[PDB]
């Protein structure tokens, strides 16, 4: 925090406003706005003003009957069993000054309206990727997702493509994206649930450290509680408290919470990897030593205690790696296995049986607080064989650190 | 610094003068200057006086209201709830008599002015950069930033590029750069805060030693006080006092001090790496041995005690690297860890458990003040695997030193 970077919490937005204002553009008919968007896309230039106006007009399907009460941060989106639309999650409409553009009036008032919103909203996910190889993969999937609605669909926008990248910087466009996704997260079985192909990346945007925390839990097979006990660094601990501040609805599936950035609820997310870099490094490093296939490409943070965090990750990963905790899950009547025989082993040198942090901290003390040859060998075997690592990635760091 | 090098402090400037004079010349209509700048950039040549005179006239927004007082070095910029502009940080006007250039009358009072001043100030950041592959990265970011203000903005300046690199030598251009950045530092939520794209690099300009002091504090995980105790060379200590002279507002976020070079408050910076070569070498080397990804490219200074500064850097890095101080941060109730078992190691030989400079100094005596075979290993293991190192860098030096 301190300067410019101070974190803003989801709950603190709703203290000062009960609305998420969506400024929808000058009202100029669905049919006309279809022509602007359709021709403007295939021509190579279309205003986000027209894109947003069309998205509002086409997505006004008041088709979602509630099965339960709808509430996030004191805002009652709905109660009992009333029917709502996508734009009940937002408010407002604001005019300014419109601009001339190329149109086609040959466009069908109905037929194009089924796939075009999916296509426009899908370009959001496409414009978030830099690597052209993977960028095409998303574009192909978007084409196939639109081919499912209309058989004869061919991608509209030319190979230029630098047109829709700027849309993510438009406040109102990202609000439609966040409103669309939150709607179909509730109404999963809805006919237009496919529209989430591109809007899904708005969910938990800039909340990478929560995903890091989730990853570490899945890879180690330990509860959120048990993972927290294995934190041995004060900065990581400070960041954990920042992430676990009460009343932010981070466990609530249906909340305004996941769409922090796109709804304009926070300018600095408390759950980002940038703001929680020590937890991110240590969490992703520990995961990598425990055979995570994704951790090797995780961004290596700057200005953190690499030396301390590396030793903490190694002791933790070595504990999980050494203690498999294999127990009988099914017995075929009478013939059972009781692990009571043998609870202690050889010397002050034998690592603990379980995964108790206090037991390993005690063992670590007796090894002079220096990673043992075997402890260093576990990490070496876990990093060698990693091929093709980028610079400033956790994988590159881990191999460069442990492969000797 | 005896000759040429006599350090000039920010506070000493305000002893002599109570104002920063901004010589904005001619001051003749925004419409005409907009035509001069627009066509000038597009033509391949534009007078800096026109750029200055335009930048002033386009940035006279008396926006941003203070909720807290504004004062630095005795200069009271604003009091309580005052509304001030970006030019309340400076003073003056000095008409001279201008010169002809290419002009567009087709230029707009509306369309331009909302991105053009941002485009001009952004050319400051691009010009300072030298490596052509990295010059494009900032140029493309600048292209996007203005494209975020509509127009499908396409870079005005041709690949000539010579014109805006000399801009950084204009006394008045850099004062506007400093005024803009300082202003939107106070009002970071302001509509025109994006104008800080190119002006951010004016802040803490030529203050690399303070940045190094910050880098080292993060990598070690120690306080400013604790880092200072680990200084074992006299020249580093002498340079530390030079940096830490009282009454220079180096900890004040809202101050004139970060823009001492660009405001012309100091001819020679106290906080420059060139004026603190011993601290910069020691700081960056220690940081590199502790797994820094940025320290490898740091400039290796001339006329310093390489041999001696290396031994102090190695001992400091070896102390941090061997003493990864791990302790419990969270516990499932009752099950707590309390250390201090034995704490007495292998006779005279065992290294201290803490990071106390005095204990490690005493330990170093027992080792006959000669790097341990294990100390040489630690550094060797940190410098190997470093690839693509450049001549006269801390990285190249460190690898040549410890890798054989």
């Amino acid at each position: 925090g301190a300067m410019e970077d101070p974190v803003e919490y989801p709950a603190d937005y709703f203290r000062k406003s009960k609305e998420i204002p969506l400024y929808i553009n000058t009202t100029k008919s669905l049919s006309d706005l279809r022509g602007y968007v359709y021709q403007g896309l295939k021509s190579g230039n279309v205003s986000i003003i027209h894109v947003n106006s069309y998205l509002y007009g086409a997505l006004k399907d008041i088709r979602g009957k509630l099965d339960k009460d709808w509430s996030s941060f004191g805002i009652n989106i709905g109660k009992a069993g009333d029917t709502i639309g996508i734009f009940d999650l937002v408010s407002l409409k604001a005019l300014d000054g419109v601009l001339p553009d190329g149109v086609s009036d040959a466009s069908r008032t109905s037929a194009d309206d089924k796939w075009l919103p999916l296509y426009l909203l899908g370009l959001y996910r496409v414009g978030r990727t830099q690597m052209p190889e993977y960028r095409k993969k998303l574009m192909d999937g978007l084409t196939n997702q639109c081919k499912m609605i209309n058989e004869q669909f061919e991608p509209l926008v030319p190979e230029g493509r630098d047109i829709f990248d700027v849309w993510g910087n438009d406040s109102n466009y990202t609000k439609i994206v966040a409103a669309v996704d939150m709607f179909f997260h509730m109404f999963k079985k809805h006919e237009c649930a496919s529209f989430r192909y591109g809007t899904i990346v708005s969910r938990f945007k800039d909340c990478a450290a929560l995903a890091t925390f989730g990853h570490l839990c899945k890879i180690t097979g330990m509860s959120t509680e048990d993972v927290t006990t294995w934190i041995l660094n004060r900065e990581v601990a400070d960041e954990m408290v920042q992430m676990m501040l009460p009343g932010q609805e981070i466990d609530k599936a249906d909340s305004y919470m996941p769409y922090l950035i796109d709804f304009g609820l926070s300018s600095k997310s408390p759950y980002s990897s940038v703001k929680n870099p020590a937890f991110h490094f240590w969490g992703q490093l520990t995961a990598l030593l425990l055979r995570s296939t994704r951790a090797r490409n995780a961004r290596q943070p700057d200005d953190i205690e690499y030396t301390s965090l590396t030793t903490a990750g190694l002791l933790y990963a070595y504990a999980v790696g050494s203690s498999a905790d294999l127990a009988q899950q099914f017995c075929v009547g009478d013939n059972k296995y009781t692990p009571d025989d043998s609870t202690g082993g050889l010397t002050t040198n034998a690592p603990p049986q379980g995964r108790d942090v206090v037991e390993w901290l005690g063992w670590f003390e007796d090894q002079n607080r220096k990673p043992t040859p075997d402890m260093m060998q576990y990490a070496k075997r876990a990093v060698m064989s990693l091929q093709g690592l980028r610079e400033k990635t956790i994988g590159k760091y881990a191999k460069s650190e442990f492969d000797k | 610094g005896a000759m040429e090098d006599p350090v000039e402090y920010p506070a000493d400037y305000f002893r002599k003068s109570k104002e920063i004079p901004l010589y904005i010349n001619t001051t003749k209509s925004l419409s005409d200057l907009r035509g001069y700048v627009y066509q000038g950039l597009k033509s391949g040549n534009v007078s800096i006086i026109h750029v200055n005179s335009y930048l002033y006239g386009a940035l006279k927004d008396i926006r941003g209201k203070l909720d807290k007082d504004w004062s630095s070095f005795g200069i009271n910029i604003g009091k309580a709830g005052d509304t001030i502009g970006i030019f309340d940080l400076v003073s003056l006007k000095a008409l001279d008599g201008v010169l002809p250039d290419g002009v567009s009358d087709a230029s707009r009072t509306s369309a331009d002015d909302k991105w053009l001043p941002l485009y001009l100030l952004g050319l400051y950041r691009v010009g300072r950069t030298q490596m052509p592959e990295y010059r494009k990265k900032l140029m493309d970011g600048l292209t996007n930033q203005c494209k975020m203000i509509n127009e499908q903005f396409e870079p005005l300046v041709p690949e000539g590029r010579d014109i805006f690199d000399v801009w950084g030598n204009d006394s008045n251009y850099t004062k506007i750069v400093a005024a803009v950045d300082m202003f939107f530092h106070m009002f970071k939520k302001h509509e025109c805060a994006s104008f800080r794209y190119g002006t951010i690099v004016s802040r803490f300009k030529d203050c690399a030693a303070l940045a190094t002091f910050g880098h080292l504090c993060k990598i070690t995980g120690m306080s400013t006080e604790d880092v200072t105790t680990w200084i074992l060379n006299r020249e580093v200590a002498d340079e530390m006092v030079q940096m830490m002279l009282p009454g220079q507002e180096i900890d004040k976020a809202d101050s004139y001090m970060p823009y001492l070079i660009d405001f012309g408050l100091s001819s020679k910076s106290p906080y420059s790496s060139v004026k603190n070569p011993a601290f910069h070498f020691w700081g960056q080397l220690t940081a590199l041995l502790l797994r820094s990804t940025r320290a490898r490219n740091a400039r290796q200074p001339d006329d310093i005690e390489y041999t001696s500064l290396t031994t102090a850097g190695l001992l400091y890095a070896y102390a941090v690297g061997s003493s990864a101080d791990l302790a419990q941060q969270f516990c499932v109730g009752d099950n707590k860890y309390t250390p201090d078992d034995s704490t007495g190691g292998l006779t005279t030989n065992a290294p201290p458990q803490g990071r106390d400079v005095v204990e490690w100094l005493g330990w170093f005596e027992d080792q006959n003040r000669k790097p341990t075979p294990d100390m040489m290993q630690y550094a060797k293991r940190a410098v190997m695997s470093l690839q693509g190192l450049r001549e006269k860098t801390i990285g190249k030096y460190a690898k040549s030193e410890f890798d054989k």
Partner: peptide, 30 residues
Amino acid sequence: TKVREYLKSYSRLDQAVGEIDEIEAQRAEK
């Protein structure tokens, strides 16, 4: 350092963080 502990107010946290990582796995690039 010294120790502090609290049972998180969220509880459904274990299910949540695993779902957040599922979406995070979808934004990764090749």
